């Protein structure tokens, strides 16, 4: 698998420019379970007005220039709340080498969380959020198929923002992520089986 990794982080709404709360658990056991990674911390405002567009820019930026400057550097992308978003919007920018070199893709709070794509999971891995629809859902693309299989969507129950049906907007449950174990376990078992194969 991967000897070298870039970890890219887009972080969500008013979080302080720095790691997202939402993937530090799991990061740090990815980064202990597969030697030669390291993080970028996607520079944008995650500004209240949610234009995510530099965000998006600076992941598909950040691909190409570590692809350019080494053609074995694989990624995982994490975005939580507007930064899934962003992240989302990236995903079709990044075709053949920078397709291939991205090897997993780990969404919470997704507001682009698509109906019943097998990438979606709810807080315990199950299904009670398979077939939400985001707060955005209803004007943006989320995941393209061709993504599917090295996506995980993680939306918790009562998330209003990747899960219309089960509360309004940014509800507690949105801001759990961080601090829940089995988010954590699953994301970090995704991350390391993506770049282990």
């Known amino acids: 698998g991967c000897s070298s990794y870039v970890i890219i982080n887009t972080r969500g709404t008013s ?10 658990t799991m990061n740090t056991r990815i980064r202990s379970a597969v030697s030669g990674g390291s ?12 234009n995510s567009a530099q965000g998006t820019a600076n992941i598909v930026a950040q691909v190409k220039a ?9 990624f995982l992308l994490e975005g939580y709340s507007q930064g899934a978003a962003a992240t989302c919007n990236a995903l079709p920018q990044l075709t053949g080498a920078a397709f291939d070199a991205v090897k997993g893709v780990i969404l919470i709070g997704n507001p682009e969380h ?14 009670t959020t398979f077939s939400a629809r985001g707060i955005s859902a209803a004007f943006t693309q989320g995941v393209p198929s061709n993504w599917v299989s090295k996506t995980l969507d993680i939306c918790i ?16 449950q949105h801001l759990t992520y961080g601090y829940n174990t089995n988010v954590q376990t699953m994301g970090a078992n995704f991350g390391i089986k993506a770049l282990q194969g």
């Open 15 to 24: 979080e302080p420019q720095g790691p997202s709360v939402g993937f530090r």
């Open 39 to 50: 993080e970028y911390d996607t520079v944008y405002p995650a500004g209240i007005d949610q």
């Open 66 to 74: 570590g692809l350019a400057r080494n053609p074995n550097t694989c």
């Open 114 to 127: 698509k109906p019943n794509l097998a990438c979606n999971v709810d807080g315990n891995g199950g299904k």
């Open 157 to 172: 129950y009562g998330d209003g923002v990747c899960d219309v049906s089960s509360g309004f907007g940014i509800t507690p």
